[PDB]
Amino acid sequence: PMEVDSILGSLSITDDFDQLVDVTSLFDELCSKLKPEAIVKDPRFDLFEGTHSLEVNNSKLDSSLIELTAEEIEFDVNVAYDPPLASVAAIADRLLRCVISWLNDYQTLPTTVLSCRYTESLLSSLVKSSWCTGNILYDKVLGSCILGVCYLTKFVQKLLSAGIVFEEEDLNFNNMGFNTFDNLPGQDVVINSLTESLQILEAYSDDSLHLTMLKHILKIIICLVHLEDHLTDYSTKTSHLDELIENANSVNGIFPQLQLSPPKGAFSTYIQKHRSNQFPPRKITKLPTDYSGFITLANDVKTILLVDKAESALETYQFAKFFNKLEQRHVIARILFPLFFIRDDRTVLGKFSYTQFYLLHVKEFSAQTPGNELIQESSNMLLEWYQNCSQNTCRYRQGFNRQLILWDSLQAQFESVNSQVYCSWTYFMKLSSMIEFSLKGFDLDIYKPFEAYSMFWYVYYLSHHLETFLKDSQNDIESNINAIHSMNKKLKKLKAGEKKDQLRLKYRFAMDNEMEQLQATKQFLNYLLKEINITKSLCLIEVFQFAILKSFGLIDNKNSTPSKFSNERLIHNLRFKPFNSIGVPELPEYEVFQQTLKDFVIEEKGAAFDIKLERATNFIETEVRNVVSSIDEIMQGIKGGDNNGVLVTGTRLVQELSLEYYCKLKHTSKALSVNSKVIVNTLKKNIKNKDSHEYKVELVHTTEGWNYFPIQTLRIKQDR
Amino acid sequence: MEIVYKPLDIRNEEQFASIKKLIDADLSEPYSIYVYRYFLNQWPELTYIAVDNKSGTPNIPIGCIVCKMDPHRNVRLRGYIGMLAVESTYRGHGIAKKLVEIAIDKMQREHCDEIMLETEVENSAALNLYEGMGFIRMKRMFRYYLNEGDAFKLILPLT
């Protein structure tokens, strides 16, 4: 308004165009001439492309209507607001908690890191320090802090350029057209700038709580700049990751002692209102109250570096099957893992090529040793399987949709060439992923309670085929072990001669080159058979629970509410659409699902009903204990290790996480038996009451249980 | 309370404005005016309103549903429910349910093979409405509505 440059600038807005003609009177009468339904547009243009449009004078969609305070408009980067030491600490504290809200809380980049007026100032001068306040804390100490976080976001940009995870749902990087080119300094300059500002704090004679927190803040930012080392140099060192944990722990105790208030307008929605913005205005989400997010980030990255210590294909396989299973890892670590696993020199972990790494998995699973297109395509398929493990809890299940049809195509191509060793491994990976893809839907609340029988029996059906395949694989390996054992039996009977040397020569060769792997794979197949029978028994318990619920008339295998649009057969095929093109194992018909349910459902009444119901509950309580025993056996072998000679789990890198997984699996097992007692005791007594309650079944997640097997809990139906 | 369900009159602009007026109050994601003209101008037959004939304002829309249909992939037509809202004083009367029925029945007349829609995992009112009509959850999108929560992709197969 009263600004001089805005007054003279109003004359220059039209200067670029030499001549202007008013067309408002023409537009009004022409638009008045059009029919109300018609829209004038380019025929090529699709009107869907106009749904992301902004609207002027719409508070929810106009960035120019953002209301700011006087302080938020008047904030100057060159003014050193008093008190300097307390404000710089308050400004620096806000920035690190803005970094956490951006990354840990999945908040937009303009709301958090770019809301800072100092961050926008430093990045703007680089495109062509930025502010000279006359105070050493704002000019050098804060100037180093802003550069470190700005250097951090540039590294986050390079992680997203790898296309590992999905933009604006795993991580938002809306930088509002900010491209620092090569003008942003290197890692050496940023660390030295932070170290020089750090030694200024060390040399300060005064001592205060605000100074001590600022000492740690510069140290924390130094550690974040060092996160790049795990990608450029692939260093497994936890030095800077341990410092970041320790410094955050020290700061978390300081927050109760002091209260920080930054200069008014230092962090605001100002950048949305004046800088080029093609998105609606957005408020600033509430920021974290502690530095606990830095601890979580540093621990997750430390876990990523553990996969470098793997010696076998099973240890990398089990790492991918557990590192991101119990809870979703930080997005920085979830991006860093496929880039750390699949490296720049086209090698996996710097030890194996893409084809070597695939041949390891087949060798360690089939216990047999033998560069064409089929092996090359399978190697790329296996790596995409590893990369999907680091996706979020939703994208994790979506990734199997692509894999299942590609594994099946890959298996059929192996069968046409009659390469049965690779065909078997592809069948294992496919059938394992089919079970995983199906049981994951319970974790995501995809299946409604009435679809529980369909999915739980299907996984049971699949688990029966996987156990059959696995037991035959162990039988084939068992005969190979006996063949070497029979040579030792035959050598003892043989007299010393030339033909005994031939058998002794081949016995040692097979004993030195084949015996160790056959034993290791035999013990590994023992673990797989125990886990699949646990997963198979849990599904059967869930099917028996559903049948008891239908027998009492509480739930059906279809939608109970009537509708005049669809039918059960169409809805059932839609649920099982992904498994439609898979030939082995064949998807059971709609009639097989129905007929199998009637085998479990009790249609008897009275005393005959009570007899068949007792056999069903007795199986649930018995099988739960048999599952607890099998889980207990597995947990001992994981604690003992693989060199004991009974089981091979390959969980050395993820021992604690795998033990936590089975303990949660044991909780759900015990919970399934407790719930079956409640259901029986409730519904038996409910039959006696003529004016009984009305129940509905809900799929409930046990808090410390494994959410792939929710508890079919019945609850009283009350109207709203 | 006498409720009448009407197909959208594209020439009636005060009815058009009351549709946007109602939807905008109850939406989290704000819609520009060309979001509405993408649906209503191109698919006028797939937007229905509910009016109260015995109310003080008979023709004002107390509720409305906005739909569209396009061929999905290549061999199937997929109807889509984009917007559904009922006035706050009129909820609990089965109004939205009949608006969805008359919309899906219209799209079924137009040879749609399926109806698709997205909704929040926390929208228990909308989930019970659709799933009670036969919809099932086919997908969960992580943070589809940002800090509102995740979303469910619902599909009702018709053919």
């Binding site: 749904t51 992301h52 | 939406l27 989290s28 994601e29 819609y31 979001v35 984009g82 917007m83 559904l84 997205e118 909704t119 589809y144 509505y145 979303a151």
Partner: peptide, 4 residues
Amino acid sequence: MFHL
């Protein structure tokens, strides 16, 4: 609902 509809979300872009």
